[PDB]
Write a protein that binds this ligand. Sequence first.
Ligand SMILES: CCOC(=O)N1CCC(c2cc(O)n3nc(C)c(-c4ccc(C(F)(F)F)cc4)c3n2)CC1
Ligand SMILES: CCOC(=O)N1CCC(c2cc(O)n3nc(C)c(-c4ccc(C(F)(F)F)cc4)c3n2)CC1
Lengths: 150, 487, 140
Amino acid sequence: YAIAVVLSFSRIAYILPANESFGPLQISLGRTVKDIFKFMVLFIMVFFAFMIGMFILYSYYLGAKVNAAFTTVEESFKTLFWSIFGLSEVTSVVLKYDHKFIENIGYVLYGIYNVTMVVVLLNMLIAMINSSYDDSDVEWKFARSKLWLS
Amino acid sequence: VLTALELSNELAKLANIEKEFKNDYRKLSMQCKDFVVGVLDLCRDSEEVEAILNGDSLSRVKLAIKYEVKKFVAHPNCQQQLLTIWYENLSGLREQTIAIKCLVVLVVALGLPFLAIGYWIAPCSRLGKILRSPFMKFVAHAASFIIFLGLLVFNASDRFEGITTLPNITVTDYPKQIFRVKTTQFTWTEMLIMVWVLGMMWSECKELWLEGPREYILQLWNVLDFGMLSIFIAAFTARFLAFLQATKAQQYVDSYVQESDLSEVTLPPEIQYFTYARDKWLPSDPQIISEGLYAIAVVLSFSRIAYILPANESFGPLQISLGRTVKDIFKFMVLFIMVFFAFMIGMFILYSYYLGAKVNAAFTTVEESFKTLFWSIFGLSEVTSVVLKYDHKFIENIGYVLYGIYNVTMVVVLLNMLIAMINSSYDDSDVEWKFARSKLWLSYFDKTLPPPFSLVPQPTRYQQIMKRLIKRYVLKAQVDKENDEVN
Amino acid sequence: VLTALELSNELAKLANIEKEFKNDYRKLSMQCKDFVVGVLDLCRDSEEVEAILNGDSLSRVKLAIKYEVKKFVAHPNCQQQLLTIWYENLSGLREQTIAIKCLVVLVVALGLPFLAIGYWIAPCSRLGKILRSPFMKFVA
Ligand SMILES: CCOC(=O)N1CCC(c2cc(O)n3nc(C)c(-c4ccc(C(F)(F)F)cc4)c3n2)CC1
Ligand SMILES: CCOC(=O)N1CCC(c2cc(O)n3nc(C)c(-c4ccc(C(F)(F)F)cc4)c3n2)CC1
């Protein structure tokens, strides 16, 4: 029911095209969302690469790690997903044992993953800026005309 | 056309060498490329297309790829030939959707060992022609690398939900067995991955010996692939060394002491160390090195998908744009290093004398300063890293000011990089992607089995065609010039 | 105009199928769309606009929407007809501001069950024509 309530407010895309101010707004949002998926596939590829790599590294330290963030597949996915928005602490790759090799490799891999996320984000932003260019006006009017004819 | 291509090469080389009149030489090279493209454009039959694409084996296409003549290779007159050759001996698959092609890839992946075994009769069999096509080679290699990734993932099985036993506790199949024997022994999946990596390493070694180390290292991505395989080999060598030590301990324990149980025996400390858990392992243990290098290798192993993406149409320009951005990054990233090292050394000098005084040791040593200022880029470093426990407000305030200036500099450089590599962006993207995909296609034309399975053992008619094409080009150029100057 | 629209469909489909000469087929489809738009542009009376918008029911508008002919449907000569049909049987509301339209939406929302109950007499009632308009359907 909570998921349904979250999705229930998405029907406003049936009402926005009739409006004049928010028509091109929704058109641009739809174009950006369509452009997202192509880059988001590569997001999945890189994210899964680092997720499996760090899970393999830290799977043997379930109780050794101070914060279990890569010990299992689910925690690795959670931590590397929340690292995109910065909500994951940097102390996720430090151990309680004096195995500095594993800890340092985890630090390096985490830094490389964050750098890759930044690089891919800027690449996506630049590409879907360049992909942007009364074409917007005629596109919005076409969408509104489809809504009218509906 | 060959003269124009070699002249384009010479003009590009002289543009690189001169660096004073680089614009003029680049313009001349573009003129040569435009002439080649225009000569190719006037084709009206497959015979003329073939004649331009190779002289009296796509020799001219390969020679244009070598000279980075993007528009000649991405031209539809050449793409129509490259697609016919690429989809050779299987034409019905060209018109199928992407989903059908992915289904074919999955079918090949499921039955790859079966078709590999049957390849012995393939030269005399009808299906051998299909399996020898330039496309089924790519599908076989892609399904092979996907199987390798699946093997890497499945090797980490039994730990997806987490190890059931704590690191502090040792588990032995029988009481007389050394724990390191249990933890270092190769599973069948690891043995298969070893064969896989040795196959890829043999392929790369053969390629390197055929080509030459200098220009082999000249390519950046080949260096990355070689480093990936070297890291895999180093990890497996460390694992094998750990296995050797464990099995030496196992031989020793049954060699001298004869007791029903191993716990009651006071083994020599060298051998007794092998009955320890992870908590008591040395920091430089061979197994630790093996696990770290294997994790790095697994991280780098999914980067080979850049060999599969260019063949696709949707993700081709995606990878092209990503590569362009990555190439643009390094120039700004050098300045990132400069500024980052400036602030890192400055703050380390400031806070090196407060090792125990600082509430959070974040700048007391060189390593902590580097760690903190690197993580400050992504915001994961706390702001309390520059506050002391002593009442020395001068040092603390200067640290605060320097940290703020460093963050401002990072923001400024990030926006500068973003703006510059937006402006650096501008069917050029289309022709670039088609050129990359054509290079990928030509990489498979003439390499039949996947890496793991490769271990097993009246002047002239062409002159007439060229004369006709050049006569047509001269007539077209004259018509275009005089039509624009009729008045 | 119908021939040009079907030819634009065929050229777009062949551009998708070929993927080698996609630029040429897309250019031809754009030529067909431009011809359709230019034919629509020369209208000077409502009769000619209607004749282009449907043959001997906005058949051509629907068929152009199906073929993604954006410029033919977004042309003012077609928008003037689509707005007259959209604001059918209530013309005074077209010139009102967005605030008045939102007030109308709120009024309908408050009295939606009442008008739904009264819809039984609506076909014989004056307000049934308003409630059956293409706009009041969207507001409802
Ligand atoms: C990618 C980001 O990953 C990270 O966060 N790291 C990777 C490196 C790790 C580390 C661990 C250690 O024990 N030590 N000890 C020393 C002397 C250094 C050191 C640090 C920096 C430099 C440089 F600045 F000159 F490059 C040279 C040497 C050092 N580093 C810390 C976490
Ligand atoms: C670059 C960011 O660096 C930082 O975070 N800081 C730098 C300044 C530091 C500091 C320490 C102190 O003891 N005091 N005492 C006073 C009265 C001020 C003060 C603060 C602000 C202003 C202004 F807003 F008017 F500019 C004037 C005076 C003040 N500041 C705090 C950390």
